[model samples]
Target chain A: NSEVIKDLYEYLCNVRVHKSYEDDSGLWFDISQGTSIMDYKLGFVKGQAQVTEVIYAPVLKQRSTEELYSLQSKLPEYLFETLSFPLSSLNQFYNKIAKSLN
Target chain B: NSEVIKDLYEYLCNVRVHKSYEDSGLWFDISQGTDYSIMDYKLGFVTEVIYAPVLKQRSTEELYSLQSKLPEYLFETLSFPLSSLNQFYNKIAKSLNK
Candidate 1:
């Protein structure tokens, strides 16, 4: 699961993507899909994924790509706290998904 | 990585999500996130992913739930389709402003 998250983050930061839209947080790109099949009904393309958006919680306030990289930059141990909890509080891990892609 | 994609779809479809916005696709949810720490930052919630607005493509006319369980819901097999090969042609991919 963590590996999936790691690759996802890397893909977002490294992989090329098209801008879907931007929110108060940051830029939001479309989700990666399988390129093999032409059918659009299926959503998950598998393996490949693009950065969704660099959401800026009310805290960080910087609203810069550095924020994501800063966290992405501090790796290995970063997974331990890649995302956090509580639906009320505010932080970098406010609306993170914890499901393992693997 | 296929597994990751598989689970992400599952998370989006099966999980309980907050309606963020909607488009020609279907209802768009926020995402899922881990409900443990309070300092870390990630998108969406674990087991509670907000489904992103289904892209306007295939048979999105009668959409519903169970996103991953759909008929082999996917296409590309490789993890990062080469940008040059044009496998990553669809608008599904996203990039940073760097």
Candidate 2:
């Protein structure tokens, strides 16, 4: 009885391993092809492509004007350059460039 | 920049927790409602109502074949106490033993 259970457990484990191997190989293929250019619009137009824009208008506004201070932020040039690299190697390239610049 | 990144991460973590809570509650409700249903129906419902019949048929055949080679205690132990699980195993065993 125990031997049957053990065999069943091993069989189930082997099945799980096989399934995992299939998934792993598929994911590895996807990751390896990460840098290839492809049509992104395919995703947008696949099912239902309904484009709509909405704007909200204020009912009333007083003539009073107030000045406000705003701060803008931008990434460093080298860090921005890293965004062009493949996602899997982006961090490695970013660090390498950052080290060279320093 | 680092502060902004940290704040974004924290916000994402909160959003994930909120979404996970909603999903957990929904799954619990489904499990409770289907506690006493038939083996095939129960299996189908859990996997997805549309694909349930197909999954149940395949699972039934697989379990039936395996149970024939398995001992009683091994079958029972693997079956667990879930009514649908026990019913599936018993259904297979009864059909094969005759």
* Candidate DockQ scores, in order: 0.03, 0.02
- Per-residue CA lDDT of model 2 for B1-98, tens digit only, reads 32332222222111000111122121111110011121221222122211112123336666565445544543331213233342333343233333
- Model 2 lDDT per residue over A14-83, tens place: 1100112233322111110001111000000111334321111111122122200100022233322212
lDDT score for residue A27 of model 2: 17
Per-model TM-score versus the true fold: 0.17, 0.13
Which sections of candidate 2 miss by over 4 Å? A1-83, B1-4, B7-98
Model 1 residue B16 distance off true place after TM-score fit, in angstroms: 13
Residue-level lDDT tens digits of model 1 in A11-35? 3222212233443222222342222
The C-alpha RMSD of each candidate to the native structure, in angstroms, is 19.1, 23.5
For residues B1-98, write the lDDT of model 1, one tens digit per residue.
Answer: 43443343323322222332335323223232221200111122222332223334325432322233222222212233223222121122211000
Candidate 1: segments with Cα more than 4 A from true spot: A13-102, B1-90, B93-98
Report lDDT per candidate: 0.27, 0.23
